[PDB]
């Protein structure tokens, strides 16, 4: 009932579900005057203010339907193509054959047709002589036209629609002057046209229900469009009451007289008491329930342009799940048919429609959510459109069809787009990873946590709080870094803060008590504190090769003073993430040389004395193409990994020079001028210094990006790899949009082993943020689902994985809540789920 839907604001589709795809007639057919066709209201509206040629290329459209394999195909009948004047006399000879041969082949192909009698292409004679929907004599003319199609087409058509979105016919045809006939600002004609459009449907329904439904046994309804709206405040009720009045004004306008009680909503009658026409109580009984089902439209026609709806100062939304929830509550749980759904793409997107995959992915995800979870009686879904066509006042500037059609080509070949392949698999499956592993980790596995820059034995206050945090965990290791600018403030070995080195020694010595073998990081840059000593940053920072020489002097200082207890060393922590901070390759050039000098200083002098291991931690985010149907994304998927992992790997692991794929691609951009930068070419000596300067592999893996292709402009680093990233609102994301994708680490641990031989691998940073501070359910799901994947690679792919370090042991007051402990160092529930996996050593 009306007014009840306001409470909405507070994985396989069912069998025998109707998968289909629909078009119009003015957008797709073309040939507006061939074979003695009458002029439509738009034909005069276009020529005063070809196309897809589907009227002649029907066999090419039949092949397109067999590709997707749809159960139904929604098309409208051009009223002036049968009767040029609208008066039912005798249909056109050639025009009748088109819809006859169309309905014949669809039944031959087991494609049940769904026909709409009016799709905004009204004959110009009824608009010129009578006046269109302003004069009410057309009500019995549309009923006459409906009778003709009920006779000669009713035997093959068992699903009929009267008007396709009558809200736009009145509001945009007589209010905004956007659609045909195009009259801006006519309050009278708007609600009068909306009146006749409701009365014309009821006459056609009672016609079919009493004169053709007995011997044809079909259905008839009306496609009503709407939008969705969210309040500017969840707690506010007036902001929610304003949303209820918004949906009523656009959806309840045509649904209450048809699906509700036979009259306009109470809010509409009260708002426009003297403008909205009156439904006699005799009319109310002859209109309530004139719909066998509830055809529904949810496309860009009720969202774009901005003047389409009245937002009442609230936020617009595209959530289809709650849109059907409002329909199921306001109209006594009907059986809905989404007769139109999908967004659009610009004309520049030929057949590489990447967003259309993820736009369709949300809707079907929300439709399935409505069916299986919200108990919405949806029995069908209509994709829109089947092929690109004339999109009304937008002309050919946008593309909404699932088949690309070159409008400048004479053959008009329908080439399937990226959404056609995705939608076909959606239909074939009627609705990427692996199950659980069930196995134990090795007893020599390094369970670790991780801190960050710890600015400065039990007398130290900050150590006591951190020492009480490493007691609840059963971690075997502890990863943290040192403030380079706090031991050598001058950046030279003359000034040695002996108090700061004594503080760090008391950290590890107190850790040696607790049994947590430490892993110290000499350098840890970020956006907050860059870390470089002030004289070094004053002297060009990392852009001067003397800073790398200053790192070796600082490295050996920590090696001698801390190598007694520390047996695991990390030089730089995520140096690949310095690009965000040609003028970056040279900076990373010194970051690579500084690592070697810090590693050669340990391998020769301090390795036999202390007997440890030294390496560096790299940003190890896995990548995958954003469109598995566009090849340019597959090649760019590895191009991201080469520009990220191999940038600091092939030198320090394998060859000694930069990755050739990264080195050769940058030159191709500079070849035609795109980049004014060049990757430095190394000599025999520098490559001989960097080669094999690691004792293991360390990775900073958090999530998985979806790279796609684009000719990025600029001479910066991001413009050198020609890559753009796509966020998927379907997949479970984090508060900071970290897409929780577990199967990315397995494909990464497999990529490292294949590329850089069989070495020991360590996961030095793996975590997730969550707004929760006491029951971080996202982290436990993130931790368990990710720890499930590293076990899969160990026991199946035989990857030498030996350590796992959770990202943050604690967080800051205004920092992203990435830690396992609160700002006040209170234990979240994530610690105890970690101990369950550490004590169990995996999942038995």
């Amino acid at each position, epitope marked *: 009932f009306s007014g009840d839907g306001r409470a909405i604001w507070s994985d396989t589709f069912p069998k025998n579900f109707f998968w289909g795809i629909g078009t119009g007639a003015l957008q797709v057919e073309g040939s507006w005057k061939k074979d003695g066709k009458g002029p439509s209201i738009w034909d005069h509206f276009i020529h005063t203010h070809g196309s897809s040629d589907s009227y002649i290329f029907l066999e090419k459209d039949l092949s397109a339907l067999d590709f997707i394999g749809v159960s139904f195909y929604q098309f409208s009948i051009s009223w002036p193509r049968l009767f040029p004047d609208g008066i039912v006399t005798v249909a056109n000879a050639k025009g009748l054959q088109y819809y006859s041969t169309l309905l014949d082949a669809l039944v031959l192909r087991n494609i049940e047709p769904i026909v709409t009698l009016y799709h905004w292409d009204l004959p110009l004679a009824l608009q010129e002589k009578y006046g269109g929907w302003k004069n009410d004599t057309i009500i019995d003319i549309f009923n006459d036209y409906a009778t003709y199609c009920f006779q000669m087409f009713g035997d093959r058509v068992k699903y009929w629609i009267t008007i396709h979105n009558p809200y736009l016919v009145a509001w945009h045809g007589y209010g905004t002057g956007m659609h045909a006939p195009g009259e801006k600002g006519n309050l009278a004609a708007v609600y009068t046209v909306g009146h006749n459009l409701i009365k014309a449907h009821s006459k056609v329904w009672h016609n079919y229900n009493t004169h053709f439904r007995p011997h044809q046994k079909g259905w008839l309804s009306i496609t009503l469009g709407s939008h969705w709206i969210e309040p500017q405040r969840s707690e506010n009720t007036m902001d929610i009451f304003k949303c209820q009045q918004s949906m009523v004004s656009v959806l309840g306008w045509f649904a209450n007289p048809i699906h509700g009680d036979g009259d306009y909503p109470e809010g509409m009658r009260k708002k426009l008491f003297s403008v909205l026409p009156i439904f006699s109580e005799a009319e109310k009984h002859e209109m309530r329930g004139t719909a066998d089902f509830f055809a529904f439209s949810f496309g860009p026609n009720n969202f774009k342009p901005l003047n389409t709806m009245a937002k009442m100062g609230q936020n617009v939304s595209l959530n289809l799940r709650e849109a059907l929830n409002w329909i199921k509550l306001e109209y006594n749980n009907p059986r809905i048919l989404i007769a139109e759904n999908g967004w659009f793409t610009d004309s520049r997107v030929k057949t590489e429609d990447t967003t259309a995959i993820y736009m369709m992915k949300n809707f079907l995800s929300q439709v399935l959510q409505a069916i299986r979870l919200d108990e919405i009686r949806v029995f069908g879904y209509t994709a829109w459109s089947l092929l690109d066509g004339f999109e009304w006042q937008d002309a050919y500037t946008i593309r909404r069809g699932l088949f690309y059609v070159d409008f400048n080509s004479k053959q008009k070949e329908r080439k399937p787009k990226s959404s056609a392949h995705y939608y076909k698999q959606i239909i074939r499956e009627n609705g990427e990873s692996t199950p659980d592993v069930q196995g134990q980790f090795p007893c020599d596995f390094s369970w670790g946590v991780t801190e960050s820059v710890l600015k400065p034995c039990t007398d130290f206050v900050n150590i006591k709080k951190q020492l009480e945090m490493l007691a609840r965990m059963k971690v075997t290791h502890y990863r943290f870094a040192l403030d380079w600018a706090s031991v050598l403030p001058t950046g030279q070995l003359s000034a040695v803060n002996r108090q700061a080195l004594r503080y760090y020694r008391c950290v590890v010595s107190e850790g040696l008590k607790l049994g947590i073998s430490a892993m110290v990081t000499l350098y840890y840059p970020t956006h907050a504190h860059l870390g470089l000593p002030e004289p070094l940053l004053h002297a060009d920072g990392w852009l001067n090769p003397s800073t790398a020489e200053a790192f070796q002097a600082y490295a050996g200082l920590c090696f001698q003073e801390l190598g007694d207890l520390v047996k695991l060393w990390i030089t730089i922590n995520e140096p690949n993430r310095l690009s965000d901070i040609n003028d970056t390759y040279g900076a990373a050039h010194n970051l690579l040389v500084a690592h070697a000098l810090a590693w050669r200083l340990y391998d020769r002098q301090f390795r036999p004395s202390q007997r440890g291991a030294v390496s560096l931690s790299l940003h190890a985010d896995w990548a995958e193409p954003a469109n598995p149907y566009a090849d*340019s994304h597959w090649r760019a998927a590895e*191009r991201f990994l080469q520009f990220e992992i191999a940038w600091f790997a092939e030198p320090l692991f394998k*060859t000694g020079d930069y990755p050739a794929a990264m080195r050769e691609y940058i030159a191709s951009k500079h070849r035609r001028g795109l980049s004014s930068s060049a990757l430095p070419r190394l000599t025999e000596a520098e490559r001989r210094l960097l080669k094999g300067t690691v004792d293991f592999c360390a990775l900073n893996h958090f999530t998985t990006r979806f790279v796609m292709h684009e000719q990025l402009a600029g001479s910066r680093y991001d413009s050198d790899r020609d890559i753009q990233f796509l966020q998927d609102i379907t997949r479970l994301s984090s508060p900071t949009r970290l897409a929780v994708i577990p199967w990315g680490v397995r494909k990464l641990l497999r990529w490292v082993r294949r590329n850089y031989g069989d070495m020991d691998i360590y996961i030095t940073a793996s975590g997730i943020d969550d707004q929760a501070l006491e029951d971080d359910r996202l982290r436990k799901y993130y931790l368990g689902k990710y720890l499930q994947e590293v076990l899969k690679a160990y026991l199946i792919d035989k990857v030498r994985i030996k350590g796992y370090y959770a990202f943050k042991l604690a967080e800051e007051k205004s920092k992203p809540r990435f830690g396992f402990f609160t700002s006040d160092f209170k234990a979240k529930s994530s610690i105890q789920f970690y101990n369950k996996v550490i004590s169990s050593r995996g999942f038995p």
Partner: nanobody
Amino acid sequence: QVQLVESGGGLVQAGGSLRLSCAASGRAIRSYFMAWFRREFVAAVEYIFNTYYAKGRFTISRDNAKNTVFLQMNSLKPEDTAVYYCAAGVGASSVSESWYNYWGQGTQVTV
């Protein structure tokens, strides 16, 4: 750091078929797009789908799982009797025998 082992052999009468195959070897080849040349441009595959010809008789595929590009030459005319070699560009985008960095040995074809 990639190598191309352009295998195959060609010595058949007119109208015959041939199954050429170039074995990919080196590092990070999935970021490379490969092509076949006769110099003259024959075919090319951007990963798996994007195929460019210069048509209707040759088929360029790329079984990336086995790291091997194929070149099915159906209805071979005697004018197609020359050496066939494979290449590998640099990810983005144009033939011109210059956008391809790595080249193979080559297989002989006679008709």
